[PDB]
């Protein structure tokens, strides 16, 4: 299933559930999300949202950063999507010749 | 029964069609990438043309055909192999001519050819 780590931070089950609903956007692509792992962390500048997810067509590794922990998470999701969309379609590029 | 006749090779990128005629140009038999059993892009392979040319030749000889004049149309991959297979069939291949249609700049082609 899905693991979430809050490094040197406390978070709530609510917040954990939020992340799960946010990662859920990746379900769009109808591909297997294998051991998704989210790491939440606090720098002096803001929060950091890390993630490593493996799929049948490669790994997704992304880091999101922002003063607002939710935005940091949202940017993490944005970076993950762009990667997942490349993983899922890059092979189609060279179908001809 | 016809001893001599013609062999037409219609060879495109998608398929190779071979039709053996009489000397007037009327078909006695024919074969293709479909007849020898292939579907899809496989019909455009050289081997396909080979089986096709053979099956067409075999059928033709069964009507007594011995010599043929080979008329070739198209730039398909299975072209030369069809010509090959006709020679190596047991027919005389009295001649070989390419009669591929080419316009002197007629009709606007489909989008994919521009």
């Amino acid at each position: 299933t899905m693991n979430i780590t809050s490094k040197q931070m406390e978070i709530t089950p609510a917040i954990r559930q939020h992340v799960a609903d946010r990662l859920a956007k990746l379900e769009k692509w109808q591909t297997h999300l294998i051991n998704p792992h989210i790491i939440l962390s606090k720098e002096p500048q803001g929060f950091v949202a890390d993630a490593t997810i493996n799929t049948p067509n490669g790994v997704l590794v992304a880091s999101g950063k922002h003063e607002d922990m939710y935005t940091a998470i949202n940017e993490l999701i944005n970076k993950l999507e762009r990667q997942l969309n490349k993983l899922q379609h890059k092979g189609e590029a060279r179908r001809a010749a | 029964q016809v001893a001599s006749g013609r062999a037409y090779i219609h060879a495109s990128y998608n398929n190779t069609i071979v039709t053996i005629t009489d000397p007037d140009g009327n078909p006695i038999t024919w074969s293709s990438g479909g007849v020898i059993g292939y579907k899809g892009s496989r019909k455009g392979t050289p081997y396909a043309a080979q089986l096709a040319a053979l099956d067409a030749a075999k059928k033709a000889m069964a009507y007594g055909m011995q010599s043929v004049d080979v008329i070739v149309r198209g730039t398909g991959a299975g072209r030369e192999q069809a010509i090959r297979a006709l020679q190596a069939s047991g027919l005389q291949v009295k001649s070989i001519v390419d009669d591929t249609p080419v316009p002197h700049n007629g009709c606007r082609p489909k989008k994919k050819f521009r």
Partner: protein, 155 residues
């Protein structure tokens, strides 16, 4: 590897028949580096096939090998947007490896309870042209012929 074509290991001829091919077969039988065990199993098998059919074990073994050698195989190649099963000739080195491999594997799918016996019998069937080993070879070949049309994609 990338730089050069690697060197085929020259094996040491076996003690009982003086045969590099036998040695190779032994190693393929050999699990966990227990070659003494491996050696016995084959030689025990060599005893058995003599009892069941009085001939030269060596002759049987070698005949079984020549019967499991695939002369043609398919190797995939994704051309364009599809993976074509391209028909290829097998190098004699590889013919050997596949033959000895399938022999042991098919042997160890058999129902009789002792290895030496399975190894014995499979070598007997493969010599006569029966058994799962030869079935593998026949199949691999049929796949290749089945895709003769793609034989121009050969590298």
């Amino acid at each position: 590897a990338r730089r050069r074509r690697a060197e085929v290991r020259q094996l040491q001829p076996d003690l009982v028949y003086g045969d590099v091919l036998v040695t190779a077969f032994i190693n393929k039988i050999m699990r966990d580096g227990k070659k003494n065990l491996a050696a016995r199993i084959f030689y025990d098998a060599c005893k058995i096939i003599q009892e069941k059919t009085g001939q030269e074990p060596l002759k049987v073994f070698k005949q079984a090998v020549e019967n499991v050698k695939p002369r043609m195989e398919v190797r995939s190649r994704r051309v364009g947007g599809a993976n074509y099963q391209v028909p290829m000739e097998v190098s004699p080195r590889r013919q050997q490896s596949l033959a000895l491999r399938w022999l042991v594997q098919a042997a160890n799918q058999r129902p009789e309870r002792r290895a030496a016996v399975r190894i014995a019998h499979e070598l007997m069937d493969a010599a006569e042209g029966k058994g799962g080993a030869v079935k593998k070879k026949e199949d691999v070949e049929r796949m290749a012929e089945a895709n003769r049309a793609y034989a121009h994609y050969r590298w």
